[PDB]
Predict the 3D structure of the following.
Amino acid sequence: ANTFLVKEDSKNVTAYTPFATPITDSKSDLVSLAQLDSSYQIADQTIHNTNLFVLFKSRDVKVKYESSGSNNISFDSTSQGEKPSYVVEFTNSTNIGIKWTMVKKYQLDVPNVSSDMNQVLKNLILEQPLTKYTLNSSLAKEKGKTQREVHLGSGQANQWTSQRNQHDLNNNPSPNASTGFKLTTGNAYRKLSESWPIYEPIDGTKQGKGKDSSGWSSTEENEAKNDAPSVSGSSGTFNKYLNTKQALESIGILFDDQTPRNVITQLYYASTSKLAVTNNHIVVMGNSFLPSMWYWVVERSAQENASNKPTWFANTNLDWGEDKQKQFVENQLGYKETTSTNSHNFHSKSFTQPAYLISGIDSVNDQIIFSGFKAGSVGYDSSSSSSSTKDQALAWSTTTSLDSKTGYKDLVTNDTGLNGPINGSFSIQDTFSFVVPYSTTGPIKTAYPVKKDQKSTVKINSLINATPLNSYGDEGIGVFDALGLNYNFKSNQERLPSRTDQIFVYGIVSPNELRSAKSSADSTGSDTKVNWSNTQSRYLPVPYNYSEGIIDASVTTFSGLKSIAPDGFANSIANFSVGLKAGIDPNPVMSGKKANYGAVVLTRGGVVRLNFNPGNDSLLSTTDNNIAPISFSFTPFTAAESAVDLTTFKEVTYNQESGLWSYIFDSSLKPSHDGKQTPVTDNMGFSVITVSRTGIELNQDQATTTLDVAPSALAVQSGIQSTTQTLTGVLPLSEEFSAVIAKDSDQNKIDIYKNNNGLFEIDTQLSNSVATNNGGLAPSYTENRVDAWGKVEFADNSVLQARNLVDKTVDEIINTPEILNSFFRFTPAFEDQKATLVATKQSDTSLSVSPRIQFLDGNFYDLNSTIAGVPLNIGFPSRVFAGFAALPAWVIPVSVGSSVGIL
Amino acid sequence: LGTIPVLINKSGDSNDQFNKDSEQKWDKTETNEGNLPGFGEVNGLYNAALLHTYGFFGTNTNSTDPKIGFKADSSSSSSSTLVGSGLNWTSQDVGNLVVINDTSFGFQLGGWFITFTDFIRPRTGYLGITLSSLQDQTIIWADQPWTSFKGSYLDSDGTPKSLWDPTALKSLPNSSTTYDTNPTLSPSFQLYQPNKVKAYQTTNTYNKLIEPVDATSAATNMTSLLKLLTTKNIKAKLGKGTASSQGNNNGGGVSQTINTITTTGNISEGLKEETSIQAETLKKFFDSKQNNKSEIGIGDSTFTKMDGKLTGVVSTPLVNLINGQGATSDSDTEKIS
Amino acid sequence: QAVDETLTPWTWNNNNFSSLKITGENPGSFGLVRSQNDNLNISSVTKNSSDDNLKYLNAVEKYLDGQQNFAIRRYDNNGRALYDINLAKMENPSTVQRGLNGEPIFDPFKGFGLTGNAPTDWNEIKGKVPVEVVQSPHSPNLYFVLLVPKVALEYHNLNNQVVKESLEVKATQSSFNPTQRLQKDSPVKDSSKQGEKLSETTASSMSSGMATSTRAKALKVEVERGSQSDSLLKNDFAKKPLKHKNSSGEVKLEAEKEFTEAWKPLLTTDQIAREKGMGATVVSFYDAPYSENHTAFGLVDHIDPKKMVENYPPSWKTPKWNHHGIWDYNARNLLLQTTGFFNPRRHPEWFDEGQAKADNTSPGFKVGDTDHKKDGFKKNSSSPIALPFEAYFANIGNMVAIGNSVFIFGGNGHATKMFTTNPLSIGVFRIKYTDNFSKSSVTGWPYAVLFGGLINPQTNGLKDLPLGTNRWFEYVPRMAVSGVKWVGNQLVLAGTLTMGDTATVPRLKYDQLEKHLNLVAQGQGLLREDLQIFTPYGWANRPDIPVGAWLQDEMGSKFGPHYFLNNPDIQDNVNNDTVEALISSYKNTDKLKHVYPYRYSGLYAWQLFNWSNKLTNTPLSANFVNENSYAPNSLFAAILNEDLLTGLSDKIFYGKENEFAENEADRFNQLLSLNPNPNTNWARYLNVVQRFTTGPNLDSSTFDQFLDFLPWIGNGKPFSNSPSSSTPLPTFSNINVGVKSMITQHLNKENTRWVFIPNFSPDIWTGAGYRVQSANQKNGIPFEQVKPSNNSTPFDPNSDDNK
């Protein structure tokens, strides 16, 4: 396909030429063609072996959770909300133009729910989604009980050293470590069958009801409503609560009037957001906005009218780099015991990390690459009656101690915080630290903050956060954990990682691995499990310079942390990621080695490079465990890339010739209204970020079979941007040129941006040259003008006599392209634009010539060129050269004839 | 080749059986209930573990327990013999040497392809070997298995490949015809002798070497074991000896080695030491990778079926032809004359 | 001439060849093809009882000339066939015509000039089948092909009463019993000759020593030549106070009373050399794909067995004898084992009479006469090593070309292997061209001399493997060969290889064979197994004590001070006061040596570390060699000197520097190494290998960890057992087997804290089957396992024999 597909709206894809012109009749309502109703919209699409694969989801979708029976998750058939999301394969049926016709249609059904699963789900509770307008102080939650309150009680740390052996806390120096955060105030937590609110607290430390469902709706909901009334063109004070309803609609939250639908519905609707296609599979994953708890592996062989089943992430073991890193995450999921009763969580029923904030998903060769953020999941005491941690989440910093032997392996396998709290505040000598200084009677023991006495009678259930933080507790360690600010005091100051907060996750998934997942999802009766063994994790905090005024040298906490966040988020503590995309390096590799491929993904403050070994389709590793897993590299944004609003991401393309990724941001995606219900007016324009590879890549020469330095990427705000125009599309014609299609008012306009030493700038003359197509598919040709086709002046026919070409046959002249380059002088419109003449025999004594000229996309066009099989009819000239004679084979017969005649 | 022998007291026959449960104690290697032989055992290894990996007791290799094994008793004098693994491969089953590039080469060896990737240019932290195993049970449980290999070759997509045909196998030199052939002359058969041994001590069992006794009449007590010397009788008790093996009836075709990259066979985190003994840190490095062996360069060869017989291949620098078929019009060169 | 579609391509089992890629000036393929037809009833060629194999084999070749067709067609670069080349049937065969400078006359469109007459021996080459093809590296349009009799393909399809196994199946009418074939009865002290034993040292020289003990002294061994024409004056290594059992006649290796229909070769080495139709052949030939005269022959050479067998080392004339001689010969014959280093009782494939000479008699030396001074002189041999039909075609296949020469490294042996018979490649042939390809020459040599330069620096794998040798080529390496090819700039060999015999380096006490039946059967050729087997309770104190010394404690009532059973706990303590009585006095001389009154002991690794043919840092060093393997028991690949393989002379010359000692006075003061003599050249061939490899690049127990990591092909499960209380245990490695304890109580009780483990606690896993006083007392054990000889009380510590 010599074309570009452009999503004109939620239903229509139009095909564009390299001349930024639509192919006529190509524009197609893919929803209508999928035989889907007018409630469906395109979520994502992809080309695989020349066919178009589309993910559609419905605004009418209604899901339910009934904790009893056991077909617990189902669609709501009553009314009209039985509207599952579909993937559809389209093929182009015509060889002239574009007639999309439907091939295969796959329904994305709701997860099976095992018994073991439904016991966790019964009491599963989920945080209200983070938005644009969520503040550091909105997130912040009331600090829970200390380790030594949980255990010993109201009472003393004069007995902390007498007692900590009788609660498996031997040598624990942290009686004042936090056991977590209160669910009586803050961001709303809700079961699968409940609805999140449109109101977010400004200070969640004071203003939320947390998981207090019943309390919200009889007390605090009327307060929120009177303080923060929806617009009605009202206006109020927004002293205690933002109103984010429109910001909510924006990120794909659905609504019956002013009330969001249930959590399970928003989970399903988000879950069907991104797609990728291999020879054998379609995989479907969720967006960067809500946590997703399941993904689809559809077998492309699937019979026509089947119901493809999603695999739970709680049933999907990843390799987090080392077993310890898994344990860290699983230990904090909840309390495990043979001794307790009805106390069910993901950990107690032997599930793993249940939820990801997925960056996106792609295919290279027959491999699915994904990445994303570990969505915080912890236990919470849902007990009723004198339970000390009642209504409290059970969470703790897991950040590596100061004394930790340095080098990555050691850092991420440090025993610090493994089974319970250890971190808080420490004033050794006069050198403050939040992290334990060391990790002597024997070695330091950590324990899960559920006191031995209540171990039988306690009720620890699972929750999921809206973000990558486990721990919302309004203490100083929380800020430092979230911002990447904990450092050792050795002769290098390597930064001390968490393994529960701000954890990024990526991998490459083989077709056998997708085969288990399909097996997990079809499993009769009990939960079948999947190992994905080509994965890694990484501590990836938000940058500390996206905040102000942090104290060191009244410690600053979440409720008081100051955001200066340039990237379209109020908050400066919760990381985000978007637009994972893979691509094959075009740069040759040494023969008998296979082509290189990577991926990239945007996170707050930087681009991440994932690196692969094409040999066995593995993550790049190196021998040393000191250097850190070489599959990952982080390159920080400058001011210009930091300024882009990441919540406006529209689409990411990769071009195999340039070896370059294009990230398109469209500001029309911003919500209509603020959290204070103020019309949003910077909703005009768009921006392009160009990502390239940097470093020494695998398999250049004998030296680069081995690598001990991770290849990385570089994001550059390219110069292609606007605060005025409405975007239709950006066509990356070449490294040297991009075409932008936009409306100023309401008609489409074509700008050409030219790369000048790494910075794109508009070229107004080339824009006018390209846009002057006169209704044709391609720019006009004018003989007397340097236009998009440069300028061609033919030699006069008197050139043949002067240079003695007339005595040659037309056939020699026609098979001598250097002679016939001497028939014209060419003036390029852009540097190194090229042109040749194609010759055609016209008679035994004459020929015609016509130019073959490169356009902006590096391709040659001539009289016979097509796009999508449609002749372009550009209008190149034909020039005639004439007078040629036969070669001298006659000389001997002729001079004999003359002699005989004379005789 | 999979043909290390195992030491046996007990067969699957009536009242001769040995059990997976209530008769072996993996947690108590200090006493006779751990069943360590102490005489006649293959050097360097451990017999009861090898019997478990072969699945001669328990449902590990078959849909029901075969009950074949070894036991140490304190009540009486006892008898034993070595027997084969159930496999008929041998160390002469070596095929074509093939060269992949300027430094990497490999060959077929029975059910494996082996590669000596680093021999010309060694490196620290690399093990120097890659291996790909065949999967087809109809080949692996055959009676003269190497006769099914049709050759191995380099291919122009950049991999070594090999051909197989499950229809190529043949019977032994006789079908037993009229009598009970206990010594069936076959490529894994040997005239293993009786070992006769004194009663084990009930406690402190291994404080001294185990004592053998006159074996010159011992054969009369162990006739089930003498029948189990022939590999076909082992296969019959393991459920592999007839059509109960199932799978493809025909299914000849092409086999290919696992994919490879410059990282393949890097084990630098399992090599060297700074806390312990090198085998133990390599054991930790292997334990998380038991389900992911391909990055170590260890795995199974991929396979595709073909129609009809496979007889051989002929090779060119551009293409490989099977039975002499597979040639093409050379379409990129048609316009030159 | 033109293509016939009725012939189809095939792979030979012995080399796995099927096609050659042509390279350089005109690319394409040559490949083997054969007729498709079924129902090949070879058993219709009836064999009578009254005649030899040769007329039968010629009748089978004459039958196969009617029943089948074979050819070597050319294909183009995309696999289109060009011309047929059925060598039995092609029209007007000719050699190529030459100019006066030896060059073939040629013009590409015309092709070669043909003389109009076939090469030499055409009347017997026309029945042979081609089986491997190669191209010249330096000469244009010049190729080489190897040919064999069709029985070298059809060997397993010939009838079963002539192509027999080396062992009989029997009728089993009395029911089966594997003990009935084994010669088993142990030797005994001679009832009329007890007194000829070694003399006790009546007085022992001081050597400035000081300590003393009550124990009996060392035993003298003396040898000297005297003046007599056929006898020594002393020869104490040749004493014989033990003799074999009588059990309805004497127990010994005596082939004619065991082999009633003895297994023998299809043809002998002296038949295959002279019957020119049955020997293998190489020819040079010329080819061009689009000429009028597209193909014609160069020259013909016989791969003559005598050009290999006359290049065997001098000791291969006497494979029943070795450089240790009389005492080792007697100790092996007393244990009913193979004497020498290569006899047919284990290795019948290399002997013209097969099993019919499976005996220790007449070893090329005078032995078994009435006087120990009369034994021990060189004489005529009873059976040299040969190259009979079965071993011969295992030494055929795997070609390569280098300069003006071409080679044959031998096959994997699947031409001629049977279920109890193991023929292998034993070396390499070379064919060389001279006078600008106007003339040719042929030769071959065994791997035993070509591998003589192997040393521990030449491998990145494990060290000290049983691949070493000395001035006598009694170590005999042989291979199943995977091939020889160019790896970039480097010439490389691959396959599987025989080590020295690791299963019989530990050796039995003389009487106990009736309770060790597998360990003797593994030496008898009855059990053809090369794996090492745990048997320590019956071994003697050292493998190398002479037979005149053994009979010093027939009761066991002194625990045999000079010679006893190998238990590791009851070794004599040298302490430091002890040495003066047991070793620190007994000085040797140019005619006197001693056997010590010391209880030596140790397990399987200490046995191999002392008496295996281990590699070392310098060549020709290994003074000890045991015996040679039944089958290949190692992986092997190597880098070769392609230049030296081209530069070495056709004929190897050995000399008196490779002969065994002519009489035992020259054996007592035997020279370990010598310089090459002025006429000899054998020392040039030692260095054809640059480097070799044998497995993973791993050291110590780490290698047992790799052995546990790989999956068993019968079920896809790794021997490590860890990927799923009361869980099973691994087989090769010791990690997580038994329990951990600190080694601080072992042996010297020193260095363990800092020079063993990188850590403060010296932890090792104690493994399966271990001894402790309690689960708390988990480190070491004291000398509490004292042991009785019979019922005659324990080992008696603080007694005057142990003080």
User: Anything to note?
Assistant: Chains C and A do not touch (no CB pair under 8 Å). The longest strand of chain C covers residues 479-487. Residues 214 and 801 of chain C are 6 Å apart (CA to CA).
